[PDB]
Curated annotation (Swiss-Prot), chains A, B:
Name this polypeptide is given: Phenylethylamine oxidase
GO molecular function, one term: quinone binding
Active site: 290 (proton acceptor), 374 (schiff-base intermediate with substrate)
Post-translational modifications reported in the UniProt record: Topaquinone (TPQ) is generated by copper-dependent autoxidation of a specific tyrosyl residue.
Record keyword Metal-binding present: yes
Known outcome of mutating residue 374 to F: Loss of activity
Pfam families: AGAO-like_N2, Cu_amine_oxid
Family designation: Belongs to the copper/topaquinone oxidase family.
PROSITE patterns from the UniProt entry: COPPER_AMINE_OXID_1, COPPER_AMINE_OXID_2
Length: 620, 620
């Protein structure tokens, strides 16, 4: 069996047993993260050894532990106690979400704040939000969540339409104490509902949409073997799933004639941060690390046939661990299908008389996650012509506030009295490259303009330049859309038939990066998001751009510390980290439920093949 | 009934009869352009007066004429004799292209150049290309084409694989004279063939692609009335066709409740320039104005069901004039269909228990044109959520040269001895805006970064600023991807329910603009291409960014001359001109036939609606 196969329910049950017998999984213990470890570097790695990494939380207040288990041999490999004031707290537990609202419901200060606003405590929902690191010295070493309140007029009401501004509370979820309740003043609670299924708001549903039927009468063109190995139109890869990162792609390769040629060893979205740009003290701390703090894989949706995924769909149902080590299946959590993608190539030639048209198609691997008010779709696309593309789709309900009388420079008005603070959604793609093998390098390619004069007498010439990034200290790069800047990952030891190194070109969308002040807490904790491109030398413990323990970590972990080793990256085993994001000034059309907006990146072959790789596509 | 209906064969025959009766279309005359004029401003106006504009060429060398005729009344409205050395030559005629190869085949200088290369003149194809304006004083006032040679080994051979470098000739196509033959030296003719249907090159065709079937059992959701009026999912528009511009969209409007709200009065691609960046004297003059010089609508393909357009397709077959005034139908030249477009909106709410998913779709209007080696697809998209998007798809065969022995800074190597010069493909979209009516203004929106300090103590705030463009002299704008720059077209006299002006936001791709030296001939003739955004006050005669007569015209017309009027554009009838393009450094994978690459722009509502406009979309 493949070492890259999905974790099975049986594997997770064995991890639980091993931890139990070792004395590491008592009634006070909770599993905050569990995932399978990738095989170590080894082109001849023979014996099967499936190992799992576990973060163990203690609800009584004892120190948490990081444990590595071998399910193959049934042993604990290492177990380290963690000093969370130094290295960061563990990810937020699903069961800690409920605790915030219930603790506040009995706090005298919370109740007095609600009574001043004539709000029934039974109708006040509390969003439990990650705390970050700011000025409160008493929070160092404690698990803190912060809570913001929303009113639910009835059980099916959309609470996001009724933010309770001017009020925030901080809670220690281990000792179960409310540390602070801050009331900065009374704002009216917006009264309009935002119930997008209420006929009063939708009006009569349209009757004009006729069905679109997409079928594959002979079944799909791809095959799935060993549970998660995909072969499709010369592509070969393994579809993994991790509770923190979500869908992970392994061993992406392309069959060029008789040879299977590697392209990407591992592709994932290794972090995503949602920083808010409202300076009100009610929200100026608000930054979601959806991947690092919340774990986007554990909130993956079950995707419905004909609604979420349309066509001839093949599903995967990944298995994760719950907080006690029991396996939990995410039924239909991953959709896979191919779809038509228009014209691939076309030419009508006057001189030869030949008319030629071929159609394109793409393989789609997707999942959707829901973190509170937000819903995100993650889509990986493989195209016939060798292009690889990632797309994030952002939808859900925007996070709301009051709209202040007299307006705001940092908040959009969506409805009478209802605001939506400005924010960004910034992703980090971790691309462990393997262009024809592991000896790779990155070049930055800029367009070069030339001045009219000798050798360019008509002033028409233009050119390009490539700069090799040779060391990590010079491999932190910024976009430059005006000069057409792209980055090429090549293998200097593998040449095409023209004797040039084979390569792939990364095309970014060139959206703005992190806008916060460079001195801010979020700029230190999300340093990856301040630059478009980072290149590191591969190391097996350098997994996330924000470090292993993001929750309440003081800053600098991850990419800034990796880069500081200043390692050789010129013709080496390297990892590309690409930052890309959406800057969201909410519009009235985003309310009461937001239409999808998108961002992504793509990689295209650049002299990887000896000619077009789609000459053998049939005419249809 | 509709004044925006497509021209009919009868109208074109009637124009021919009117011109003949008036003495303007004798046997020495040729129609170089014929198109219907849009109604003048005034909702109602002329009851029905269909007017046509005609450019009449004279093959005996007499001066050409611009003529306006009323087909309704059977009259010539105006006829002006043109001074082409001043205002520009007429577009190239299809019959002039054939002249070039035939004239050169009997020229002693051409024959000696081919004899020096051991080439058989019967196998040498000549690409006839527009001449531009350079240093040759004898070309002023004459219709010139320039020829580059390619060898065709046999009648079905792709001649583009065999460029004859070092050789170019200039031809007067009216007096039938070869003016100059320039031979800068013998280059080897690349010998490899580029025949992408030859099994020796394709290999065995794939048997792995299973069919994808897209059908609409109840027919499409849009209706077509009056030949070219579309209603689809609250959108309303008319699809026009012009032999110069191709597909033109008129009267784009959205039905919001019981109000039909205008958005765009007229949308077209009003110019497209393809400048080459090779400083060799054999090619340094090479710039295609596909729209203005060649007329892209004239070369539209007939699109094949199931190959070019897949699904439940509705076709339009526009009628154009040939060079004698006879109607010519372009059968199946426009495809229209709706497409599934994934998730529209999605949210699973923990507090209400409601799970909500809706799917998106788009309406597609497309045509394809072939100009020599290149093929371009023009796609207009309408989405459920009010988004409008344009996409250009570039494919075909790249233009080739020899690859010099010691390499090149301006040419890519594609195959042994075979080069492809660097070039760009740059488009100008002309958007005659009508956001809720004709009183519009444009604002430039930049993100604003804020420094940590008083009122921003945690350094997290960020904002935006909008700058109104009030006069034409300040409305020539550049992109700035780093600051997230976009442009908003709003109506200051039409407010949404929050008392804010309704608007649409233009999102650019922020690709490089024209790279040539600003002193060059092409920078003067294609001045529009040097900036991303221009805004003018509407005027009936300001139709193209390059002026009416582009062929062999120096600078002095087009957008720089319009802008000098410095007209008020703050709440007025305005036109937005957006430049966007691809910079093409050809790759090996582009050879021997290029996979599609794309570029475009989109417009999204920005407080145009009072809430999401897709709340009434059904589940299905
Ligand atoms: Cu957002
Ligand atoms: Cu090109
Ligand atoms: Na690597
Ligand atoms: Na206008």
């Amino acid at each position: 069996a493949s070492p890259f196969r999905l974790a099975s329910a049986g594997e997770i049950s064995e991890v639980q047993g091993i931890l139990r017998t070792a004395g590491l999984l008592g009634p006070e213990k909770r599993i905050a993260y569990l995932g399978v470890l990738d095989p170590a570097r080894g082109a001849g790695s023979e014996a099967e050894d499936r190992r799992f990494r576990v973060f163990i939380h203690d609800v009584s207040g004892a120190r948490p532990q990081e444990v590595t288990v071998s399910v193959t041999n049934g042993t604990v490999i290492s177990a380290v106690e963690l000093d969370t004031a130094a290295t960061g707290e563990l990810p937020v537990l699903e069961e800690e979400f409920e605790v915030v609202e219930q603790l506040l419901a009995t706090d005298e200060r919370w109740l007095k704040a609600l009574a001043a606003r004539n709000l029934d405590v039974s109708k006040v929902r509390v969003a439990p939000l990650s705390a970050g690191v700011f000025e409160y010295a008493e929070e160092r070493g404690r698990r803190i969540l912060r809570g913001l309140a929303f009113v639910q007029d009835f059980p099916e009401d959309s609470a996001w339409a009724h933010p309770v501004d001017g009020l925030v509370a901080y809670v220690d979820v281990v000792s179960k104490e409310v540390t602070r309740v801050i009331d900065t003043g009374v704002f009216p609670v917006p009264a309009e509902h935002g119930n997008y299924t209420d006929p009063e708001l939708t009006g009569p549903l349209r009757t004009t949409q006729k069905p679109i039927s997409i079928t594959q009468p002979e079944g799909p063109s791809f095959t799935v073997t060993g549970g998660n190995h995909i072969e499709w139109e010369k592509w070969s890869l393994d579809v993994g799933f991790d509770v923190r990162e979500g869908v992970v792609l392994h061993n992406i390769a392309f069959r060029d004639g008789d040879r299977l040629r590697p392209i990407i060893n591992r592709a994932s979205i290794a972090e995503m941060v949602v920083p808010y740009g409202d300076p009100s003290p009610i929200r100026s701390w608000q930054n979601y690390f959806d991947t690092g703090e919340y774990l986007v894989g554990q909130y993956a949706n079950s995707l419905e046939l004909g609604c979420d995924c349309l066509g001839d769909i093949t599903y995967l149902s990944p298995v994760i661990s719950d907080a006690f080590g029991n396996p939990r299946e995410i039924r239909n959590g991953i959709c896979m299908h191919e779809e038509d993608w228009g014209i691939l190539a076309k030419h009508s030639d006057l001189w030869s008389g030949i008319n030629y048209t071929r159609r394109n198609r793409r393989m789609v691997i997707s999942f959707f996650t829901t973190i509170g008010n937000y819903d995100y779709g993650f889509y990986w696309y493989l195209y016939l012509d060798g292009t690889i593309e990632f797309e994030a789709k952002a939808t859900g309900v925007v996070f709301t506030s009051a709209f202040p009388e007299g307006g705001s420079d940092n908040i959009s008005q969506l409805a009478p009295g209802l605001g939506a603070p400005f924010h960004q959604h910034i992703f980090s793609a971790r691309l462990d490259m393997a262009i024809d093998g592991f000896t790779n390098r990155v070049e930055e390619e800029d367009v070069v303009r030339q001045t009219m004069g000798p050798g360019n007498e008509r002033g028409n010439a233009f050119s390009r330049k490539r700069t090799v990034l040779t060391r990590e200290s010079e491999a932190v790069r910024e976009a430059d859309a005006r000069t057409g800047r792209t980055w090429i990952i090549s293998n200097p030891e593998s040449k095409n038939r023209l004797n040039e190194p084979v390569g792939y070109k990364l095309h970014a969308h060139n959206q703005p990066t992190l806008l916060a002040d460079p001195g801010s807490s979020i700029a230190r904790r999300a340093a990856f998001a301040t630059k478009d491109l980072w290149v590191t030398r591969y190391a097996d413990d350098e997994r996330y751009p924000t470090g292993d323990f993001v929750n309440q970590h003081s800053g600098g972990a991850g990419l800034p510390s990796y880069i500081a080793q200043d390692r050789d990256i010129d013709g080496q085993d390297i990892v590309v980290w690409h930052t890309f994001g959406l800057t969201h000034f909410p519009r009235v059309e985003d309310w009461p439920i937001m239409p999808v907006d998108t961002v992504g990146f793509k990689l295209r072959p650049e002299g990887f093949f000896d000619r077009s790789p789609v000459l053998d596509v049939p005419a249809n």
